[PDB]
Symmetry: C3
Subunit: 102 residues, 3 copies
Amino acid sequence: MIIVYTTFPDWESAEKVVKTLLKERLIACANLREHRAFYWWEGKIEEDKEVGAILKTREALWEELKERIKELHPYDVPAIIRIDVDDVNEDYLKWLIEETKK
Amino acid sequence: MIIVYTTFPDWESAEKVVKTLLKERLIACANLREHRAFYWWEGKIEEDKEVGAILKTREALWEELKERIKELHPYDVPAIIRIDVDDVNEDYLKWLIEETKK
Amino acid sequence: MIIVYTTFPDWESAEKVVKTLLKERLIACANLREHRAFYWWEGKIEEDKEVGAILKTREALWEELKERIKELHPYDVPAIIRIDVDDVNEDYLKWLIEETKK
Ligand SMILES: [Cl-]
Ligand code: NA
């Protein structure tokens, strides 16, 4: 399995996106939590309060998921970061696989 | 070293497990923080407030830690996610190795 | 690219250090959020509130970033954990590369 990390400007946009992904079976679970983002933007550093989203799904769904996220994300150029999970307990993997599309 | 990520239903169960893993020195450190989980639960999309736990330990203790977490975890099917650390400052690593069981 | 995870004792230090890293063009973005740390220290399990920081930058800047963080961090032995990003949307990578020093 893999985790995909992306961030949102608020809870409504974040929840809408994750629920849409769940409905479309592109991810099995999402963990959302707030954070303060500090970053470079057009010549100056910006500070925004965001909602980070840790998505859990299959490596086989990475490409499809990445493209779907692009279509749904409020940011024109959002962060869609893939970090592979080296290993996970068999019972959880079984669940994640059953809950996601082939 | 590796990072192990798992979620708990509340702060009480989270702290209990983490303190036990620490006492038994299966991990050297844990970072807990709340988040909102969204997932499929046998036919429907559920939402739950959880406490996520980021555990820091060594590769060699993965199997034993995974098994111990299974025994202590409040969920019958918990998420026990292993993500290897590609690199870390040598003095922190020495500390982590020294604090965990050999 | 890579994500670097480090923790701070408070927001003052967390913000000062991440902004310095941003201004020295060693990272493009940083996501900070509080968490509760539980860890072994000199024979006792300590507990402390911390500000965790997720830094995003180029793989090529790892060593410089690691050394710079060591030189700026309030902790004598901080956690400087590097986790490689297996893949990311090219549009974001383009921006990240453009915002970090060459
Ligand atoms: Cl996190
Ligand atoms: Na990896």
